[model samples]
Target chain A: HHGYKMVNPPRVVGNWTPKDLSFEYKDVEITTEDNVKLSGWWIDNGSDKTVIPLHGYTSSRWAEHYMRPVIEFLLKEGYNVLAFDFRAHGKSGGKYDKEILDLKAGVKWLKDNYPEKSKRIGVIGFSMGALVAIRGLSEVKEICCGVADSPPIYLDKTGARGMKYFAKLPEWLYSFVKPFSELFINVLNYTNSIKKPLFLIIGRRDTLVKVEEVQEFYERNKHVNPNVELWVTDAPHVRTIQVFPEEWKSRVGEFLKRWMG
Target chain B: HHGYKMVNPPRVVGNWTPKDLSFEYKDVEITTEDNVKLSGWWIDNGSDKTVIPLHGYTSSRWAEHYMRPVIEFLLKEGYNVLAFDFRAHGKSGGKYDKEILDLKAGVKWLKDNYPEKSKRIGVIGFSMGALVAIRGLSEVKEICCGVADSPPIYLDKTGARGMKYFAKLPEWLYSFVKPFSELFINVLNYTNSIKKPLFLIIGRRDTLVKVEEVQEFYERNKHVNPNVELWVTDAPHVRTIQVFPEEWKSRVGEFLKRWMG
Candidate 1:
């Protein structure tokens, strides 16, 4: 079977407006090498610390359900959290397939523009945001701490859990049939340079992610960074916040204070 | 266009053997009416109290993921718990359909066989099990109390969440083409039933079952029974057991003692 077919790309809209939260939107547009201009929102809270939060795959900047609570929590705690939608989600210029590049652009924009700020940076991610944050950690040099909630660690697990929920294809064919969007992230050498203070949160009964594979990931990449901490919750999948909201918030808050403060 | 026809019904596997947990060897078979028969391992704890836990839709007797923990916990708390798989799941008989009949059969078996046991009987269910439990409450007059966890009251919500995840067909199409399981349950004329205490537990952040809908379900069904009590958990779905195992055990135990004992 033919793997891919090239076609003319369509023009996209990258402008977003927040309906719930009001702020002076410092929108930034960065053009990638492939003639794609990505869009994001940066809120300047006049704080020494800056936090860049990313949403999950196919989700908008609103992260609609989760982003506001975390942002409001961090903001009240005196941290300037700069949360934005990635491409293909929210008002991003490019398609959703270019998440890794969008993450790189976010880091680049922060580094180039907010160079004067105290570089106390913490990244929070949910679902595919976990993978994007890890990729951003590898690509960006100034990230102080990271929170990865339910990362799709291995392809097999992703196909088994997510693909099963999506497609009816046989399990054997899933491993070899990687999506182009996923392949692009791989091509960017995303996971290769994940040397950062990463906090991996997973569920013990997470039917979505294979815990064994996530454990293997920590084992394989443990030598990459010593500041890595693992938090385990007992839920089906992607429910770290629900299962241990108080603990999760305290741990992340403490991690930010200790490293990025 | 002509409606598409489906293939032969899926095969059902009866009889399951547990690997680690104390309850092993699930005796399973199909009834003459194509109903699946599932019986739990009866442990000789010599306790009068017995818990009859019903499985969710398309679920089998191997509902050990959550039920096992509760059963083991209740067993330790001087109560016997019998968790049986409904038809069409795990080690059960017949095809996966008609849950009311399956639940009714399970309850009838319990009432007929365990007459000498303590009159205090409690039913616990998660997700689809919650809906089926409501129907069970209407049909089975002997149950002392009911525990419905993360119950999705609206059929539309269930179809939206489940078909969005499992079926490739559009949600509209999937919703329009349902077998009307709820209608089948009501056709038995069991809405006006004998009184028993009911316990409703819902999660705040459960995306599958909206909290608002659960509340509305309570308000709509509250007038039917006087001994109904409601509880909310910060965890999603069935994570209440995992998040607050001690609290969950104590609450259910206390409820059973007060009502059944």
Candidate 2:
């Protein structure tokens, strides 16, 4: 049951892509370090600066409602965007725990396909996607800096604890739920490797993704890089762009330019 | 999906009953205040002292390996045993969160069916069942004193965290899980009203159910009831009877008699 749930969980696949936003794009395919196949949309505006957008869990690159705007803003700013699905998510093949490889492959795909545009790669992700944006720093040295919006760290987001919500399950399923839950990585400890400029967006009142642990994440990464930036708002999880689009565009635009440029 | 998992989880039902031990018992049916029907085994040892043995999650009254011996010991010691399943468990008809009524109904049944034996009642439960034994103190009065074996209190045993283990679920399912998961009870705050003698077994090296939170439970309950007792062991969860049956029988046997006698 868990095997089916993890591999084929709830999905948010939208019908629209970056091309629907009236931009030039290519449906690209790449393989991970472990040879798992992954799919993404690479919108190259012929710009030297590139921004990799990682969509949250259960969501894909064409998650039009939220991630599309993120891509649109990057496109208007004349930055190349490579927004892809993690393994077992979006159009990607394979299951969880291979996402780090997905990110590495996306970065390598940019450098391999468009060398001029790959030099300056900044990543921005929301929620679970936001976690990999920062966690990917340890392996992917090509990432100049990144932004994490509502990244779960040191929160009650433990996998074993999450099984209680599955289909109104009885509490006894805990024994069956424990082993599979431990598979998801805890990015809380992974923040120690941050040494590049990193931007963070925190939804102070986020009910969807808890923001209580944001303070600890801030404490760990603030001193790692000289140009670390944080934006705390009363908006809900990943809702800063939706609630205060102008401020989000202005501040995030400058943060990426200052580092990715 | 979560609803089915919660209502019908993994179970540990044995083929035998108290009659297998040569003790006389009656298969009894009772109704909770909320009108939910529950099933039970009432072993009449022809004694005035009665002990209600509540089984752990996924386990039923005929759980021969662990709970049968408990019933055997109680019968040998001249104490009546009423071993039954909680709501959404064993032969009980309903789901989680209504177990308090199940216990109360079991106690009321004993009082109405066998008034003489109901004069002195002691309750004992394991894990999630252990929690209700104490939490029930807020409502049930027939329970003179009780024992909580490996009860979860202030632990990472939240419903949401448990969801992660469900079939290696994607971390993104947290959004889908948060609502159903939030329904599971947290016994930490429910420990406030313990004004009766309670015995708790802690597996210090327990890797299954967390034992670290046992200390605070000891602290909070020890003060409320002067005769409250705790037995810390290197045994894993609920294994005190298996590992140290003699001591378990001696201390627990004495603890219950001191209060119920």
Candidate 3:
């Protein structure tokens, strides 16, 4: 096989900016352990509960148009938002696996800089960011709750399946190449250590990450974590908000409110 | 409707390294007019003909495995290669539209630093990089020949179609959002000024960029540029090399040799 293909860096053009929505935001940069500068925006509100939003792979804080509604809902419900780009993604540096450190650094930055708002910090991560957020919660102690949307519970299986479907690889070849893809972060290993409120969201029609995989992941960690919630919608990967906008907002908003309140 | 989703940035993993191939290479950085630093590799083979390889949107030079056989073939054929990340894509800095300046800076760096090899400098760009390469030929005078693979000729049409398909927006909505997507580099306008030998490659099964669009692009530019070549293969977008490795290498290598020899 050839080398890994990089996805396109997202353009920042969207329906509306935070300013257009009458929300005040500031550009923030956090330095990771590897010295990569991660760029982000801190949307300020006078809320005690702060939500740190992590984007999917090859995405930035500006991409994921669906997240806008969620962010707006959070801000309107009196939650300050801190959204940043992972390294090698938006205006950040370093590669993918190193993203756990980026998340840890972001949480640390929030804790040190905005100690008042950081007391009840929550995370909302999508796709690859979800995996990183889960892993980061294991490492960072300040984050009290997190919402992982369409996360790949098993890296090897997801990687192999991705090659089979997206890359159009044969099953035999995928089996052979499966071992090499094992380098991805394993969310299962960190499940038992998750002590806070965790919300798992998945799309039933997600061809990339199967519903069975998310169900299995939730089932594995549901009992381990005292406050765990699962929502499987009739949508595709990361499209739950797009498909069921009201339900998505209500479920996610209620989860954060009930837990982080 | 939501904003455009950026593809994932590629992980730099592959079967072999430059050392395994026994080729001498060096890490280089080129500065764009906007002061964005683009990181790249200069693989030397002591040849007068130097090929500059560019990756598509959301991709880095190392991510596209399909380009490997072609790179190896170029090296074996005694052609030097310079592969760089476009601004906002890989290790480079800057936004999307700023990438045209990044390409101009890359060619300028090659010409200024490696005068002998830069004399016959050619470009091999895939996907978005292909569009950048084609447009770059009109702006940068040092480029003698180029190969654009899976390039989107018309930015507005492709952008509208992409929004319709990927974002699942109505045609009326896309028409309103079409102006925002026009930030992408346009290859159609620059075709008239393309004096160098240009080769266009596309896949028949490319879902993101249609084959018909590529054919139309070729049809429009065939008479404008006398030495233009078009190749439509039974491959997907940016995957001609993966589908037909031997033919990919031979056709690309022969074209570069003929023009840059």
Two-chain DockQ for each candidate model: 0.01, 0.02, 0.24
lDDT of 3 by residue, B209-255 (tens): 77777787778777778888889899877778887888988898788
DockQ, candidate 1, comes to 0.01
Q: What is the lDDT of residue B210 in candidate 2?
A: 62
Better of 1 and 2 by TM-score: 2
For residue A60, model 3's alpha carbon misses the true position, in angstroms, by 3.7
TM-score per candidate, chains pooled: 0.44, 0.47, 0.73
Q: What is the interface RMSD of candidate 3, in Å?
A: 9.4
Per-residue lDDT tens digits for candidate 2, residues B1-261, read 112222132223345677767998888788888988887888888889899888876566655445777888888888988888776555565534667778989989989889898789998887777877877665687788888887777545634445554544333344333333444466667557777778888886555466657777778767666867777887766667777888888988899778878
What is the CA-based DockQ of model 3?
Answer: 0.24
Which candidate number maximizes TM-score?
3
Clashes of each: 6, 33, 8
Alpha-carbon lDDT, every model: 0.59, 0.71, 0.71
> Model 1, residue B260: displacement in angstroms?
76
Summed over model 3, clashes come to 8
